[PDB]
């Protein structure tokens, strides 16, 4: 029955891992790297992405 304690640990670990994985999402933008967008897109339209 220690899985009950284990499940508490796993859920927090899983949720944190899900948050980390979300960074790679482009969210409809050109790329998921903040720096690359700015060098690729000029300030007049970079803020859109």
């Amino acid at each position: 029955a220690l899985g009950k304690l284990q499940d508490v640990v796993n859920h927090n670990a899983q949720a944190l891992n899900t948050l980390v994985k979300q960074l790679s999402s482009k969210f409809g933008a050109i790329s998921s790297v903040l720096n690359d967008i700015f060098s690729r897109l000029d300030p007049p339209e970079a803020e859109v992405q």
Binding site: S39, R40, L41, D42, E45
Partner: protein
């Protein structure tokens, strides 16, 4: 139009400021913008058609 003469450009330093001043071009467009700062970014597999 039929040919779509294309060039595979590689292994050289590319400066596009030459183009801007060249032959008083009366139109251009990038679809990836940053015409001023294209010169800073390195590129892979540059392929130009005319």
């Amino acid at each position: 139009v039929y040919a779509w003469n294309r060039k595979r450009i590689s292994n050289c330093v590319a400066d596009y400021s030459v183009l801007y001043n060249l032959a008083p071009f009366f139109t251009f467009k990038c679809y990836g913008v940053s015409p001023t700062k294209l010169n800073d970014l390195c590129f892979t597999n540059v392929y130009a058609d005319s």
